[PDB]
C-alpha cells in the first residue's frame, strides 16, 4: 500500500515556499527561515 495514498497534511499546515518546511496555522512566519506565510 502506497504511503502517498494515506498521507494527509495536518489541518491548517502550510508549506513554506522558500525552504519547504511545514508550519503551523497560527505561525505567521516560517519557524525555520522566517519567510512570511503566503
Amino acid at each position: 500500500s502506497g504511503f502517498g495514498d494515506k498521507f494527509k497534511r495536518p489541518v491548517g499546515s502550510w508549506e513554506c515556499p522558500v525552504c519547504c518546511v511545514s508550519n503551523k496555522a497560527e505561525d505567521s512566519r516560517c519557524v525555520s527561515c522566517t519567510s512570511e506565510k503566503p
Binding site: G2, D5, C19, C20, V21, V31, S32, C33
Partner: protein
C-alpha cells in the same frame, strides 16, 4: 501533498557535503536558495516500491568553516546525515560536536554517519577507528561523492526508518552526475569487509 522530509547535511567544511548532495541531478537543477540562512535546499526524489519520497536536503554555503550553524538551519529537521572525510582525522574528531549541536535542536531524529572520499588511496580513517555510530546506535556508510559509491544507502536507510517499512526498496536509482573518479570494485569489497569485521570487534 507529497511525502517529503527535511534532511540536514552537516559536518566539517571540506568533507564533501556539497559535492555529495550535488550528485543528484534534478535536486541540483531544482534547488531552492534560502537567503535568510544562506542555504540551498535540494529536492532529492527517490522512487520506492510504495511511491515517491522526497528528501529536501539542506546544504550550507560554507558557514560551518567559521562556527556553528544557526538554530533556523536545524529547525524542523526530520532526519540528518553527518559527514566526515576519511582522509582527515580531525573531521572525524568533530563528529560528536555535530551530533550534539544537532540533537540540541532536533532531539532523536534518525541520523546516518557517512565517511566520504573513500576513492582516495591514502585513507587515514579506516574502518577499525570508526566507532562513534556504534556508541550512539546509528547507521554508518562509506561513501565517495565523486564516484557515486553508496550514494543511495543513507537515503534508503532513512526512508525505512521514517516510513516504518523495513522492506522498502528503491525501484530505480535517481539520475546522478557521471562518476568523476572510478571506485575500484575490489577496493569497495575490501572496505565493506573491513567494516563488517570491525563490527565483530568490541569498542575499547
Amino acid at each position: 501533498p507529497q511525502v517529503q522530509f527535511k534532511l540536514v547535511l552537516v559536518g566539517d567544511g571540506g568533507t564533501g557535503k556539497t559535492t555529495f548532495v550535488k550528485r543528484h541531478l534534478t535536486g541540483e537543477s531544482e534547488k531552492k536558495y534560502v537567503a535568510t540562512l544562506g542555504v540551498e535546499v535540494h529536492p532529492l526524489v527517490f522512487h520506492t516500491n510504495r511511491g515517491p519520497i522526497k528528501f529536501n536536503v539542506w546544504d550550507t554555503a560554507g558557514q560551518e568553516k567559521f562556527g556553528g550553524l544557526r538554530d533556523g538551519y536545524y529547525i524542523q529537521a526530520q532526519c540528518a546525515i553527518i559527514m566526515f572525510d576519511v582522509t582527515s582525522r580531525v573531521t572525524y574528531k568533530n563528529v560528536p560536536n555535530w551530533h550534539r549541536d544537532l540533537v540540541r535542536v532536533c532531539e532523536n531524529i534518525p541520523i546516518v554517519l557517512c565517511g566520504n572520499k573513500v576513492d582516495i588511496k591514502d585513507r587515514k580513517v579506516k574502518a577499525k577507528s570508526i566507532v562513534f555510530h556504534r556508541k550512539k546506535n546509528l547507521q554508518y556508510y562509506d561513501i565517495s561523492a565523486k564516484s557515486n559509491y553508496n550514494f543511495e544507502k543513507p537515503f534508503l536507510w532513512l526512508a525505512r526508518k521514517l516510513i516504518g517499512d523495513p522492506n522498502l526498496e528503491f525501484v530505480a536509482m535517481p539520475a546522478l552526475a557521471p562518476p568523476e573518479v572510478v571506485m575500484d570494485p575490489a577496493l569497495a569489497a575490501q572496505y565493506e569487509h573491513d567494516l563488517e569485521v570491525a563490527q565483530t570487534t568490541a569498542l575499547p
